[PDB]
């Protein structure tokens, strides 16, 4: 098969699970960890894609052993680039984000922690979570390259997790 440079883990945080939640994200579940190109397709095409997820669902794909959390120590000093999509219109962009990540396509790919798609009421969001937020040059490269991979033709912002940790403002914009 075709071994990936890294192992990745799919997590769901479902509305149902959130309903039972003790704290934010305590509900998040690692569903599956894949290590090859073929194993990716195997699990990916057998799970819910954002266009078929209920409002409130968060769907993650993160490097193995990284928790998708501000307070995860690998994530702590990082941030996120965010793209916005209309309801039901993010599936293909979700996929390319994933294939770009697992294929290690980003020039500055070492900073990459993972991505998430957030299914909401009016729209859907995709964010890439990165590691070394203060490395503007890295983050700016990544975001620019992500637009290119997505053919996203709108401005996108990078928000530091620190700052996050709704009145959080974009530190960078591409």
Residue numbers in the entry: 52 to 216, 220 to 228
Pull verbatim passages from the article behind this deposition.
Hence, allelic variation in genes for the translation factor eIF4E has accounted for differential susceptibility of their hosts to Pepper mottle virus (PepMoV), Pepper vein mottle virus (PMMV), Potato virus Y (PVY), Tobacco etch virus (TEV), Lettuce mosaic virus (LMV), Barley mild mosaic virus (BaMMV), Barley yellow mosaic virus (BaYMV), Bean yellow mosaic virus (BYMV), Zucchini yellow mosaic virus (ZYMV;) and Pea seed-borne mosaic virus (PSbMV). Resistance-breaking isolates of these viruses are not uncommon and comparative genetic and molecular analyses have identified the virus-genome linked protein (VPg) as the predominant avirulence factor. This is supported by in vitro biochemical and yeast two-hybrid assays that point to a direct interaction between VPg and the product of the dominant eIF4E susceptibility allele (eIF4ES), which does not occur with the resistance variant, eIF4ER.
In preparation for a structure-function analysis of pea eIF4E in relation to PSbMV susceptibility we determined the crystal structure of pea eIF4EΔN51 by molecular replacement, using the wheat orthologue as a template. We therefore designed a version of the pea protein truncated at the position equivalent to that used for the crystallization of the wheat protein. The pea protein was co-crystallised with the cap analogue m7GTP. The X-ray data revealed eight independent copies of eIF4E in the crystallographic asymmetric unit, which assemble as two distorted tetramers, and within each tetramer a maximum of approximately 600 Å2 of protein surface is buried between pairs of subunits. The m7GTP ligand is further stabilised in the cap-binding site by a van der Waals contact with W180 on β5, and additional polar interactions with E122 on the β3–β4 loop, R171 on β5, and K176 on β6. A superposition of the wheat structure with chain H of the pea structure gives a root mean square deviation of 0.708 Å over 171 structurally equivalent residues.
